[PDB]
Ligand binder design. Structure first.
Ligand code: SF4
Ligand code: SF4
Ligand code: FCO
Ligand code: F3S
Ligand SMILES: [O-][O-]
Ligand SMILES: [Fe+2]
Ligand SMILES: [Mg+2]
Ligand SMILES: [Mg+2]
Ligand code: NI
Lengths: 262, 544
């Protein structure tokens, strides 16, 4: 019985798309990961225990002799003493702060935990913040809405087996976020030739012309989408739609309107 | 009989795990049965507020992040809603593509719910270790189609895997499970626990395939990126090889639905036949899905292949048409400012106002949607009763198969068991329709690849987008003023099912359904979970 590193996974202000993304991993599949590689010790979406039994499981993990890594999905809503987001009668900010204090490392899965995400968009009625801001500690950020499981699982595995990966200015592993979406886009030759679709119904769009005039944020977005694809089959631009810039901090506000460059 | 304690007092379950989002359930129990209940949603994000003043074209990208479990469905409802507001009729190919992506989402969503969210309420995973794999293989041959995954050797390999895991002392997601040490409310023989556990593991792999299928048309999953105002952007999705791969993957997924999902569902239903007498409600609503005409909300309601309708007081002889003007939302028992009761979504208000935990006057972030003053259950069971009542041939056939297998009357479906069964029933039906739907779009796409219609942004308009998402009747409602979002309101299946009391003090469907719940062990109240999970809760959807 080789001991498997303990992982505590918290859900704050989130849509669960990051959990869903993670379980699309195929190298390895999620069962192999949690049976052979990690000990996934708290995960609200799939854990058997509920209520006090679940809360007890969290505290058991947090007190584990061997320590644990923390994964955080979701931003933290801070208005009104953090009471607009609660689990087990405790503000999410309180529980996340507690879990983070003794974590071996903190991985923020998704743009929400990394940077604040959709609920932080203007006018931010819940006063949501990203984890690093809310806790005042450095986080390994795996952004995207959601990130590719290749990027999340690769980060987790890197962290448990190699150390902390080199991170960019925004906390993202350069292994996955070092290149612009645009620099790897198959439509780049059209961009270079000023061959842009003026609308989705246009013949230009049928011919696979560049989507920049239709708001594509590829040129300013760091991600590996066209290189690794999603679900082993596709990515947004391949499906004829501009990139929203979803791995960029505060993209809800910096990359909108989505169908324009203005 | 059904195990039941003598317990009298309160039980709170927070967090409700194995759902999307953050739910607290409070009940009062008397002599081992629930006598009162509160469904208290514990997170607010405020997407409707965030949307104000923004580009209507942006709405679908914000609202899709209402939820990543029912990914896509909000992008779809928003896209339908803006299409309606700008008065554009999408090309036939766009209707077909949008509807197939919805079908792929049903398949993925329902498989994951049954196995990874719901099954642990009925299946004691640790008891699988007690099973003899040979006896288990024999039993499997007697409850399900022949398959190599159900052989003694395959089931032994699963058992050996589970044994090594449990013996490691690191139980992970099974830590403190309600079934540890045995539980009077868990009925399954060890052999059935082993069979279901093997399938649970298989389903973790098969869901990846269901998502791959969906992403061929959707761009990616989660969070698709192929819809635009006026139709779809994905010209490649109309082409031969992608569609052949889409078909091939969908067939694998559907083989698993038919080989594992439905058979496990039926075995669980047979062992837990008493759950046909627990957790019923009376009113059902659906906007319908899989329409042949999506030119308007009216046409969607009328031509949905999974029909729309309203059933009241379990009367299957009187399916009414949906009156979209009769929907409104109350906030009397919700964490919103005073003055917001009785609002049709076009006039919706979202003014958050928290009080305190377990304030019986204000106890949820969900609004309370009502229909002419009545609560309405939405989702697979609502769709199933409506279709059955209307004599929809596929539902009639499959419902009757299930009723004949379990030897129960259709009235037994007004229950937590029925709610669970309905989810499988409709999954089998989607599966049976995939090839026909794929061929329709393949042929249409080959003849003419029109996928997006021209449209014009009006200065001022309003519109509504309807869908029946995996969890039920979803609607998005926009008011446009100065070509910008003046109001955007989501009314979501979870809101209908799990919201709090309405302005009359009337319980929501989940609160009503919880009344009468037996509690065998107050320390480990799995029966509360059985009913709540059967509604397939999504709190991020519900509150947005
Ligand atoms: S990053 Fe996106 S997909 Fe992940 S929880 Fe936030 S809204 Fe959902
Ligand atoms: S479609 Fe987007 S990422 Fe691709 S070449 Fe054009 S601007 Fe760049
Ligand atoms: N299905 C689903 Fe999600 C909920 N409730 C939506 O819409
Ligand atoms: S929207 Fe996001 S998923 Fe990739 S293509 Fe753009 S970064
Ligand atoms: O999930 O809605
Ligand atoms: Fe709403
Ligand atoms: Mg439409
Ligand atoms: Mg224990
Ligand atoms: Ni949802």
């Amino acid at each position: 019985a080789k001991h498997r590193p303990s992982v505590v996974w918290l859900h704050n202000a989130e849509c669960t798309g990051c959990t869903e993304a993670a379980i699309r991993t195929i190298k390895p599949y999620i069962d192999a990961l949690i049976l052979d590689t990690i000990s996934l010790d708290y995960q609200e979406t799939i854990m058997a225990a509920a209520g006090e039994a679940a809360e007890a499981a969290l505290h058991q993990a947090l007190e584990g002799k061997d320590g644990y890594y923390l994964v955080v999905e979701g931003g933290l809503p801070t208005i009104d003493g953090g009471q607009w987001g609660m689990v087990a009668g405790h503000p999410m900010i309180e529980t996340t702060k507690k879990a983070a204090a003794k974590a071996k490392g903190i991985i923020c899965i998704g743009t929400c935990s990394a940077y604040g995400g959709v609920q932080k968009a203007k006018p931010n009625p819940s006063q949501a913040k990203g984890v690093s801001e809310a806790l005042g500690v450095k986080t390994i950020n795996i952004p995207g809405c959601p990130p590719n499981p290749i990027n999340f699982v690769g980060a987790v595995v890197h962290v448990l087996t190699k150390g902390i990966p080199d991170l960019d200015e925004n906390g993202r592993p350069k292994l996955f976020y070092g290149e612009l979406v645009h620099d790897n886009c198959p439509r780049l030759p059209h961009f270079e030739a000023s061959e842009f679709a003026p609308s989705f119904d246009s013949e230009e769009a049928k011919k696979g012309f560049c989507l920049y005039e239709l708001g594509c944020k590829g040129p300013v977005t760091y991600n590996n989408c066209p290189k690794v694809l999603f679900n082993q089959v596709n990515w947004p631009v391949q499906a004829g739609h501009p990139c929203l810039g979803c791995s960029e901090p505060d993209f809800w506000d910096t990359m909108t309107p989505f169908y324009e460059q203005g | 009989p059904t195990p039941q304690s003598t317990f009298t007092g309160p039980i709170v379950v927070d967090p409700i795990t194995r759902i999307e989002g953050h739910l607290r359930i409070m009940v009062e129990v008397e002599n081992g049965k629930v006598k009162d209940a509160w469904s208290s949603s514990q997170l607010f994000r405020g997407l409707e507020i965030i949307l104000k003043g923004r580009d209507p074209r942006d709405a679908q990208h914000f609202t899709q992040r209402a939820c990543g479990v029912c990914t896509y469905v909000h992008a779809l409802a928003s896209s339908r809603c803006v299409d309606d507001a700008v008065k554009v009729s999408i090309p036939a190919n766009a209707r077909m593509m949008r509807n197939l992506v919805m079908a792929s989402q049903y398949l993925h969503d329902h498989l994951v719910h049954f196995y990874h969210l719901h099954a642990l309420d009925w299946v004691d995973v640790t008891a699988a270790l007690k099973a003899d794999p040979n006896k288990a293989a024999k039993l499997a041959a007697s409850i399900a189609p022949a398959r190599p995954g159900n052989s003694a050797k395959a089931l032994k390999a699963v058992q050996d895997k589970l044994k090594a895991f449990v013996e490691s002392g690191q139980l992970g997601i099974f830590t403190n499970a309600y079934f540890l040490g045995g539980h009077k409310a868990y009925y399954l023989p060890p052999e059935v626990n082993l069979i279901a556990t093997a399938h649970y593991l298989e389903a973790l792999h098969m869901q990846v395939k269901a998502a791959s299928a969906m992403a061929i048309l959707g761009g990616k999953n989660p969070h698709t990126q192929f819809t635009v105002v006026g139709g779809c952007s994905n010209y490649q999705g109309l082409t031969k090889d992608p569609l052949a791969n889409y078909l091939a993957l969908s067939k694998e997924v559907c083989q698993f639905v038919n080989e594992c999902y439905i058979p496990d569902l039926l075995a669980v239903a047979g062992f837990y036949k008493d759950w046909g007498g627990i957790g019923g409600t009376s009113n059902y609503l659906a906007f319908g899905e899989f329409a042949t005409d999506d030119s308007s909300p009216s046409k969607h309601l009328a031509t949905s292949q999974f029909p729309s309708g309203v059933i009241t007081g379990r009367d299957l002889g009187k399916v009414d048409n949906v009156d979209l003007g009769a929907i409104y939302e109350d906030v009397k028992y919700s964490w919103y400012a005073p003055g917001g009761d009785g609002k049709h979504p076009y006039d919706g208000v979202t003014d958050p106002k928290y009080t305190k935990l377990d304030d019986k006057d204000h106890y949820s972030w969900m609004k309370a949607p009502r229909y002419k003053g009545k609560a309405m259950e939405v989702g697979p069971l609502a769709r199933t009763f409506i279709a059955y009542a209307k004599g929809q041939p596929d539902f009639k056939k499959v419902v009757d198969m299930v009723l004949g297998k379990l030897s129960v009357p259709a009235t037994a479906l007004h229950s937590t068991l029925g709610r669970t069964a309905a989810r499988g029933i409709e999954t089998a039906i989607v599966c049976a329709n995939m090839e026909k739907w794929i061929k329709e779009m393949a042929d249409s796409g080959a003849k003419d690849n029109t996928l997006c219609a021209k449209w014009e942004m009006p200065e001022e308009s309003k519109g509504v987008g309807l869908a029946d998402a995996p969890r039920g009747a979803l609607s998005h409602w926009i008011r446009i003023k100065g070509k910008k979002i003046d109001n955007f309101q989501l009314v979501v299946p979870a809101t209908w099912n799990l919201g709090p009391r309405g302005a009359q003090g009337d319980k929501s469907p989940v609160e009503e359904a919880l009344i009468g719940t037996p509690i065998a062990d107050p320390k480990r109240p799995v029966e509360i979970l059985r009913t709540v999970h059967a509604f397939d809760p999504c709190i991020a959807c519900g509150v947005h």
